[PDB]
Ligand binder design. Structure first.
Ligand SMILES: *CCC[C@H]1O[C@@H](n2cnc3c(N)ncnc32)[C@H](O)[C@@H]1O
Ligand SMILES: *CCC[C@H]1O[C@@H](n2cnc3c(N)ncnc32)[C@H](O)[C@@H]1O
Ligand SMILES: *CCC[C@H]1O[C@@H](n2cnc3c(N)ncnc32)[C@H](O)[C@@H]1O
Ligand SMILES: *CCC[C@H]1O[C@@H](n2cnc3c(N)ncnc32)[C@H](O)[C@@H]1O
Lengths: 343, 12, 342, 343, 13, 343, 12, 13
């Protein structure tokens, strides 16, 4: 299947094992921003659900399907590939909704759905939006969508902005300099110091930060879920040219994302920006290998190139340059294995 | 520092 | 191979991916109790290494091989299955020890060695001692051990004692009670509270605690590495009969372990007991879903059954009973998926 | 057949009046200096409402309020008391040389015969949470003896309800119920009754005081005007509420207290049991939710408190509360007659 | 005491 | 029935409502002295139960019946008059014991059993043993006992001893002296002081004490449940002739009780004595209206007369005199309404 | 302190 | 983090 062809089996085993835990459902459900916003988007656009056929891709415990039922949906197909599907079926029965919600265990790329649907709902966002490659499963489900059907969320914006964080940058060398000693219990560790450094710089940093470290307005890369094909997410090239609002050393790029639920009655926004209340997605920062000095009014231009891999994630290639000085840096990071730095 | 199987971060 | 037959492929990928990270070598190396105690056992038993042939099973960055080299070994075969073997080879060259340390990349169950060895060294202890199923690899390596060859560590002691900790119990119970809500955003979750309690209490709790929570003297279960066979660790049965020293609620059993390096000059102990300085193994506690009330002088009897699984860990079965009242508790725990509370 | 016996199980009435036959219980109420001092203030500062007037004292106990009416210059005071405390009141009337002004009439006010209509009725008809004891109905029933121009002391009653957060109280109760979760109590599985035990414990309203900082929204007020109300008005008391949450957090229940006002000709005097005021022997009353509701500041918590009078001289309490923004709903039923005295 | 069925008024503080 | 002819309906209603609470089952069950000893008495005499027919009188939640089953009983009839019978039925089903335990809701004086039994088990002890008059129901149940049958408990001992407690005695006048003031808010209360004193002295004191307050060896009054008849408990006369071990003022008599389970294998004792771990029965002290001075070696003779009443308790009349001096004191107490003094 | 209706004392 | 799959050795203290 499409999912098997793009995913190493060992990554998939561990991925769905994670999502088999009720504690992980609980983690996401207790994110009031996440859960409350989805609920508001669905209920405030009840006309998009009233008497409609709905597909819920990756339903977990089924909360979004219950929200679609609260909004008057006629029939809701909930697809979930982890063992959480069995727990969802328990919730459907205990909530007396077996007539309206059908739980279908399995991957959306492999299950058979008997009907075309009026609207697809899902929470396919990983950290930095694209991790997990669940957006491609969400887009793949459009084979079940009627023409002129809708998608909730309807669009995803990923935002990129340059940041300055001297302490974060220097922390990488303080940790790697553990290896720069000539007699650790009589052993010279120095020869591995460079490898230690490279290892830390390949890790994106998942945590939050003060918005005052941002040095330019973000650049936005929009994915329109109604228009896009899943092939669009295999290679994502995000050009940027930041107009620097502050002067100082740029140590890397900071990432967050928004999604919009574009309903017939209103549009509702779920945001993970650092200007908004913190969510379980936090934000993500990728360091440059070397900082770039940029005066306010200079332009920082480059590309962030996301290349999907068979570990349900992306390799991140960042190149950046201060146009007015020609100073360049880059880095190559493994999104699958970030450093969770939040305290 | 290395949390290989944590797909979603733990909510704050 | 023996390793392949007993291990799910996807568990091994993730397992050895973890050990390929230099930051994880740093993590264990910076445990000064751990590294310093290993160095002391080897150097103070330098006679067990002087001009000896050595095998280092799971050498990581090779630190134990360097200790064997400092203690006078003639040749050390350092076997490591993760990509860390490449970094160990770098360190051997930079420390000018190529004539004495030979890194053999691979699984100890699969590689070939040129000759039998006088002594095997390794750090096979996971948390609760048995996690990782590395003790079996360690014992498997005895096929390369000469008759009357030694092993460092030589024996491993598991200790289990009943504990009382209302706070820990109610912390885990509260988490599970999320699934007791009848109207979470209007949705009844209570049908899953049973399953939630099961899931949360399958998780051993890795952290440290004050010794004052122990309600009886520990029972010891010993694995003699010089004698044990691989198959002795597939199904480990640990009976216990605690004599309760204090009255109160028994919320579970606490676990720790000591290993001894029984060398020719002295025995050196590496302990993870809560009475000793803290290590990166901490201690491990297994909770009962409902605690048992016991009076001082009562006996708590039962069996802890460790059954090895294909994910390089153990399914833990604990059955416990207050003999005087017949109050029983049974729990199943997934050693692979703990809750790191520290 | 008397109005009293028609609405009261005799078994309840025997126990009820036995309690009030004890001098130790009169001392308990009399030593409440806020209670006794406020009643005396309300009567003496409105002495013109009593000077040369005919007074009815309903449920006079040992007679203290009748003595206050006498100090204010009442011409005649009929003091009705159904417990054996009436005989002790007679002793105090004689030893205080007030036989010419205070006439004790033993019995229930629904059953005695008064010699004449009165200018003013005084009473202490307030139980905990105001409504317990159903003495308010006896107070209103006594208006058959009140002149058209008459007054009531107290004149009105205000019940306040506000949502509260108290994790400690909630877990204290839930911990007791959890005894019945044990699967092997002396080898016996009790867990089949855990549901019944939770229901039983959370059926008890909690009588104690608390810090006002546990209140999460301004209180709602329900007013009973004793001059206007009729007995039958108190058979079914319906208190809708719509709280505007001032703080985020878990709503563990509703907290109750009451004020009464003595609306005299000279001034109005208030007797408050509010948690912002000095503590009385009524304390305050909290009704817990079996599962607390999560609410954000700015959300609205709406529902109704329904009190159904029962034959045990108390009310069956039904509380239904809903977080409007999320549809998180909690329904509870409490037995006001059998509270947990926690203080 | 969890249940005082006959206590009509609470004990004064 | 025998029960209804000796019990006022209002007493019975409140009595069984108290026992309808799971919280009150739990209160007794958590008394480990009480529950543990019953389990030890039954299990250590397993041959009195193996393959036998048992009757459990006043079984509450049924725990004694589950102990009889643990001991191997073939058929247990468990009789309980409160609504707790419904919960016992749930427990019998959930413990998969419906084949062996049959719950019979009702008063043991009114139900029908299908056959005679080999042994009766019960907890008929109230405080001071005799409160609740449940011993009569236990003795009444012997109409279902086979000629050779046994009873668990088999006998009960009540112990009486004189005590000195100057502070407990003076406490009564401190409390009553509330009424001895000429102007409580302008009212002379002093005429009720004597009645208040009488009220306090009529209350048995339920709490524990140091055994050093006892001034003579205890006298023992024994009820043999195998031989006694219901009527033997209507009038219980306990003569005493204490030989004083210490000189001092005797302020009253202290009461406690032991029961013995006399089985084929061994006798097990459940003691509420002040020399033993405290139980929920505590101990019971009855004051004298006036203390009696006794020298060590003097004799304190008298009688304690317990007269059963229709409120499922006893009127207590105690008369005592110091033989060497003639100094005499008495008291009349209402066992149904004790003062709980334990803190 | 008084225990009106409490047939058995609260356990200790 | 309630579930740290892949963390084989606990983080040092
Ligand atoms: C962040 C949301 C993850 C959520 O979706 C499920 N999931 C992931 N990939 C899936 C495919 N291909 N089909 C069905 N469900 C799928 C995860 O298991 C989790 O519940
Ligand atoms: C606790 C440290 C274990 C250590 O040993 C390595 N390891 C694990 N399993 C192995 C087999 N079968 N052969 C060789 N090395 C092996 C881990 O990678 C880690 O470094
Ligand atoms: C809160 C104090 C109430 C007080 O009034 C007496 N009482 C209660 N109900 C009564 C009726 N129906 N008639 C007369 N007195 C009545 C209580 O005994 C108590 O003293
Ligand atoms: C001390 C506990 C008494 C226990 O027995 C029940 N009870 C009391 N009187 C009873 C009669 N006559 N028949 C059956 N059960 C009876 C109490 O309800 C309590 O459970």
């Amino acid at each position: 299947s499409v999912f098997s062809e793009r995913t190493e089996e060992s990554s998939a085993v561990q991925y769905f094992q994670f999502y088999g835990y009720l504690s992980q459902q609980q983690n996401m459900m207790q994110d009031y921003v996440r859960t409350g916003t989805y609920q508001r988007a669905i209920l405030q656009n009840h006309t998009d659900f009233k008497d409609k056929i709905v597909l819920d891709v990756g339903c977990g415990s089924g909360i979004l399907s219950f929200f679609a039922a609260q909004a008057g949906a006629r029939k809701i197909y909930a697809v979930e590939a982890s063992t959480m599907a069995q727990h969802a079926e328990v919730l459907v029965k205990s909530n007396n909704l077996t007539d309206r919600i059908v739980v279908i265990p399995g991957k959306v790329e492999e299950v058979s759905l008997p009907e075309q649907v009026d609207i697809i709902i899902s929470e396919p966002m990983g950290y930095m939006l694209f991790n997990e490659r669940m957006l491609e499963s969400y887009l793949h489900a459009k084979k079940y969508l009627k023409p002129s059907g809708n998608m909730f969320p309807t669009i995803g914006d990923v935002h990129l902005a340059p940041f300055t964080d001297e302490q974060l940058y220097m922390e990488q060398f303080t940790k790697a300099n553990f290896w720069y000693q000539p007699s650790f219990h009589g052993v010279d560790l120095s020869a591995l110091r460079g490898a230690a450094v490279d290892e830390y710089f390949r890790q994106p940093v998942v945590d939050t930060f003060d918005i005052r470290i941002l040095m330019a307005k973000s650049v936005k890369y929009t994915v329109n879920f109604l228009e896009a094909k899943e092939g669009d997410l295999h290679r994502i090239e995000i050009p940027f040219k930041f107009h620097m609002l502050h002067s100082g050393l740029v140590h890397g790029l900071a990432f967050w994302f928004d999604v919009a639920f574009i309903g017939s009655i209103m549009t509702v926004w779920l945001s993970t920006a650092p200007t908004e209340p913190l969510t379980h997605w936090y934000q993500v920062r990728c360091l440059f290998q070397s900082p770039l000095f940029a005066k306010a009014g200079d332009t920082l231009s480059g590309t962030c190139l996301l290349i999907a891999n068979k570990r349900q994630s992306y390799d991140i290639s960042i190149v950046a340059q201060v146009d007015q000085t020609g100073s360049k840096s880059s880095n190559l990071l493994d999104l699958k294995n970030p450093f969770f730095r939040y305290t | 520092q290395n949390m290989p199987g944590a797909i979603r971060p733990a909510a704050p």
